[PDB]
Amino acid sequence: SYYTPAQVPPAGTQVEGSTKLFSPLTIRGVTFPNRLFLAPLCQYSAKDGYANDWHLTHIGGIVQRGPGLAIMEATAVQKVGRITPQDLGLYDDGHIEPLKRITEFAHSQSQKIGIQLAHAGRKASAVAPWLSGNAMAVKEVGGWPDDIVAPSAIPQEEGINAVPKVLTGEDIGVLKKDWAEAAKRAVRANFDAIEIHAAHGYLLHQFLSPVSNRRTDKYGGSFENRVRILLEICEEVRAVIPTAMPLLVRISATDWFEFDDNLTKEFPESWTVAQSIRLALLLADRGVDLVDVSSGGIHAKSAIAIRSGPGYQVHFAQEIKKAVGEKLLISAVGGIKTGALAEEVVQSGIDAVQAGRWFQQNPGLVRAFANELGVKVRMATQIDWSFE
Amino acid sequence: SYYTQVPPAGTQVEGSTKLFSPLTIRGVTFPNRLFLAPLCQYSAKDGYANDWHLTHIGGIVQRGPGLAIMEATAVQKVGRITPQDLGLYDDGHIEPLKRITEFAHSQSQKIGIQLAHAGRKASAVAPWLSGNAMAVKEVGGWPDDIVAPSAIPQEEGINAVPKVLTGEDIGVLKKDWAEAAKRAVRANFDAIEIHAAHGYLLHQFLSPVSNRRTDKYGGSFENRVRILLEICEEVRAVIPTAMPLLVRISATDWFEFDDNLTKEFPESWTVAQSIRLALLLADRGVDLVDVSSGGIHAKSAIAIRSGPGYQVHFAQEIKKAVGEKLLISAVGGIKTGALAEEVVQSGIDAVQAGRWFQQNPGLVRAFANELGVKVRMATQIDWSFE
Ligand SMILES: Cc1cc2nc3c(=O)[nH]c(=O)nc-3n(C[C@H](O)[C@H](O)[C@H](O)COP(=O)(O)O)c2cc1C
Numbered sequence A: 001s002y003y004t005p006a007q008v009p010p011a012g013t014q015v016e017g018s019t020k021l022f023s024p025l026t027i028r029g030v031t032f033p034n035r036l037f038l039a040p041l042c043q044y045s046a047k048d049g050y051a052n053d054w055h056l057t058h059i060g061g062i063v064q065r066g067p068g069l070a071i072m073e074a075t076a077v078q079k080v081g082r083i084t085p086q087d088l089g090l091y092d093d094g095h096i097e098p099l100k101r102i103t104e105f106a107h108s109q110s111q112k113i114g115i116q117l118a119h120a121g122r123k124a125s126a127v128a129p130w131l132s133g134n135a136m137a138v139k140e141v142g143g144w145p146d147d148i149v150a151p152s153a154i155p156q157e158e159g160i161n162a163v164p165k166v167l168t169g170e171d172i173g174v175l176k177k178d179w180a181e182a183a184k185r186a187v188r189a190n191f192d193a194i195e196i197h198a199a200h201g202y203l204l205h206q207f208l209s210p211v212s213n214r215r216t217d218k219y220g221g222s223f224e225n226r227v228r229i230l231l232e233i234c235e236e237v238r239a240v241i242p243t244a245m246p247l248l249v250r251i252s253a254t255d256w257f258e259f260d261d262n263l264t265k266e267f268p269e270s271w272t273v274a275q276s277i278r279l280a281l282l283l284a285d286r287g288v289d290l291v292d293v294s295s296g297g298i299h300a301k302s303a304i305a306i307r308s309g310p311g312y313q314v315h316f317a318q319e320i321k322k323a324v325g326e327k328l329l330i331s332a333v334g335g336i337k338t339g340a341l342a343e344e345v346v347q348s349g350i351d352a353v354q355a356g357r358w359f360q361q362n363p364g365l366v367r368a369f370a371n372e373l374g375v376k377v378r379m380a381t382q383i384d385w386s387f388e
Numbered sequence B: 001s002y003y004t005q006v007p008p009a010g011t012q013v014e015g016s017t018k019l020f021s022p023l024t025i026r027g028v029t030f031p032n033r034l035f036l037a038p039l040c041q042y043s044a045k046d047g048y049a050n051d052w053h054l055t056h057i058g059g060i061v062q063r064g065p066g067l068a069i070m071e072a073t074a075v076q077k078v079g080r081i082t083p084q085d086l087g088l089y090d091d092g093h094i095e096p097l098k099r100i101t102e103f104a105h106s107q108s109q110k111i112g113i114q115l116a117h118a119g120r121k122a123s124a125v126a127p128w129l130s131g132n133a134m135a136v137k138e139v140g141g142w143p144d145d146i147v148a149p150s151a152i153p154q155e156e157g158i159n160a161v162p163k164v165l166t167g168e169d170i171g172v173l174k175k176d177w178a179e180a181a182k183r184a185v186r187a188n189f190d191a192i193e194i195h196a197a198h199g200y201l202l203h204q205f206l207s208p209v210s211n212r213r214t215d216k217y218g219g220s221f222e223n224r225v226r227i228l229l230e231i232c233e234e235v236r237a238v239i240p241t242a243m244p245l246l247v248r249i250s251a252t253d254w255f256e257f258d259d260n261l262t263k264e265f266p267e268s269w270t271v272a273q274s275i276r277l278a279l280l281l282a283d284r285g286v287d288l289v290d291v292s293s294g295g296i297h298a299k300s301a302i303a304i305r306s307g308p309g310y311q312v313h314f315a316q317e318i319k320k321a322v323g324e325k326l327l328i329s330a331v332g333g334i335k336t337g338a339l340a341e342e343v344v345q346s347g348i349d350a351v352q353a354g355r356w357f358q359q360n361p362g363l364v365r366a367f368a369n370e371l372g373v374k375v376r377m378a379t380q381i382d383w384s385f386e
């Protein structure tokens, strides 16, 4: 073989330097070149759940610049489980082909790509956040307010959201099968990893939290009952995806009520960090490789933790990681917006960090972090050449 | 109508800089005067655009350059710079480029493409392999088939000696430039640029260093500019009258600024000739000239340099000479918003940036921040700042 090109590592490889952040991480059959992941970040740009060239150019522009793993936004496992009418879906076989075009591009760059499987439950059929932080998408704009579902018939915010329909046991069986089928579709779309969304007040968190889950069947009313649907979904997803495939779960570490004097009185039973630790070990027992630690979402008084400060919920990730040790990988997310902070989080014992907004603000976040840390991390050949 | 506006990304929503003020050419309005300069990606096979080009251009267009000019795109197969260049020499090239213009248009953005021919600098390797070396046939090259006005290699002992274009070859070449322009129109580009710079084919005719012909295409100024004037006429005859037509020139071979190089190359391409040419181009429906420099010789490299605004003065000299008869853009190290605004406030109509966009696709927002103004991004991108 003549004129063989010089071999190069994937973009995102630490070619000079010894930071932990830009050191590789292997989970089962996949090696990520570094531990700075793109967090799932809804784009509100789809019709009928299909990815289009917005998603391809958005994700592709970031993947050119070497995140260790690029996790695609919340992708609904049921049509009625979309957050907005503009969400991605994996509930139709037709969804596979456009997503495959994105994974193909990532793989042309020798990059790793994942997707977050999701269901919004009682927070479904809402409008994009630039229209409202919480308002219904009515049927005339593609909404389905009459068809949203939940563990209990309680609206997210009364007077704003539709009252959800209560899932029956049969409905829960169908839901679990649909989660598994969406996972099978993600595999057919050639994703390298899958994440289950169990956070941010969406359907699985609605079962986890006694604030939203008032059921008295086997899916509510005790810790074992409240985590049951998530544990069952993890088992059934693991049963249908390759054993080589990393399985991630994103959780809300707490409803935050436990940390405020008044809110604890108002909601004396809620989802808490101690329950998250207990849950994390049960997840590890079912083949979940990594848990990403966010927080919030279950109530108007408990927003999704999208905040303005640095590393604002790293401490939850650290408490969980201290409790679980090497039995489970942990990633932190939230305001991890400089290289110094990202490296400090992983040096403290956290296995990886994720950034969401900071990648959309700066698709070259990896190189910014590398520059701050005084190390060299390869970009795409064309991009590195542009610095000449 | 129930449940019913935002301006395009790149619109100055607060502030009064000239840089982020709109510019109208014929039937097209650009929301600002910061353009993405043509920037080869060396990522194509057989001239076809692919998802590298789509994700590269799309990621920049999301962030609102007034006009995104796509890289040198060959009008003949043998006119590619490298075997990895884009082409518009085959109808098959239309649909992949159409996907890119479709995405730009979904963002209400304007997109152009640079039609090009490398002449005696064709069939070279990508620059990270060599600044100048032949792509041999075994790696997709065509050294035996490169063409030029005169049988003189770019660098002797490095580049193949080119075949001399005959009169009939020149007729075919002009028809191929026009056919590529027709294909660019069918791919739904908003604007077209003719590449007449950087030592490539049309500059090879312009400069007496490379053009030693004694037919009607060499040996005098009128003869040396002839092929470019004729190509501009042929292209204008086949594209919409509403379409902006740009030309990129090399302002000079640089030999005129050094006594020894003037002795060694007593006739070369010069700024004064660029001024004369610019007015002839304006007469033929060229709307805007972008001012670069260099390329014709090892002793005259393409001006890709490390300093700020390093050939702004050529653009200013040409703009002073042509006045309102022609629009002028500057390029080269225009890497901060303060500099870009100073350049346009000196009378230049627009500025272009190449490397600085690939380094930072959000260059527009960086420049706007430095200037203390607000320039809209795609809705999703502006939302990510909440
Ligand atoms: C516009 C937007 C969309 C988001 N979409 C998702 C999503 O689809 N899934 C998810 O789990 N989190 C989502 N999040 C939360 C982020 O993944 C992330 O956890 C949060 O923004 C904090 O990290 P950051 O400071 O790096 O952005 C979103 C956040 C924003 C601002």
Ligand SMILES: Cc1cc2nc3c(=O)[nH]c(=O)nc-3n(C[C@H](O)[C@H](O)[C@H](O)COP(=O)(O)O)c2cc1C
Pocket: A385, A386, B037, B038, B039, B040, B041, B071, B072, B114, B195, B197, B198, B248, B292, B303, B304, B305, B331, B332, B333, B334, B352, B353, B354, B355, B356
């Ligand atoms: C990698 C690379 C590729 C380029 N490709 C082209 C091209 O296709 N056509 C062109 O006219 N100029 C091309 N240029 C020159 C640029 O358009 C630009 O004029 C030059 O890089 C200086 O401007 P800048 O400082 O903004 O990069 C290229 C430059 C580089 C570094």
Ligand SMILES: [Cl-]
Pocket: A074, A200
């Ligand atoms: Cl979310």
Ligand SMILES: [Cl-]
Pocket: B072, B198
């Ligand atoms: Cl060039």
